[PDB]
């Protein structure tokens, strides 16, 4: 049940979601832990606060460290696409 969610932000704000990683074939270390109120992740509202992300901008991140995913989204631009799983 992998639903794909694009997140459009402005240049003044961020996407407004926090990724929590746990530190690997059947492992999903990264998920959503919180959502900043009044953020594009809150307005798009397609993210639940327990969604395990499989990929970021069409790039598998299950075997990717936390810092690399942060750097990936940090350069992603004003739109990012997460492949997620609800919870």
């Amino acid at each position: 049940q992998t639903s794909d969610v694009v997140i459009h932000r402005k240049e003044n704000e961020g996407f407004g979601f926090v990724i929590i990683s746990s530190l690997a074939t059947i492992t999903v270390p990264h998920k959503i832990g919180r959502i900043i109120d009044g953020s594009p992740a809150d307005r798009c509202a397609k993210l639940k606060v327990g969604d395990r992300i499989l990929a970021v901008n069409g790039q598998s991140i299950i075997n990717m460290p936390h810092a690399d995913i942060v750097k990936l989204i940090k350069d992603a631009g004003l739109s990012v696409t997460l492949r997620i799983i609800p919870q």
């Binding site: 961020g14 407004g16 926090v18 929590i20 746990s22 919180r34 942060v70």
Partner: peptide
């Protein structure tokens, strides 16, 4: 825990 990383984006 100590083996976890939270960072907002």
């Amino acid at each position: 825990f100590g083996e976890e990383r939270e960072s907002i984006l």
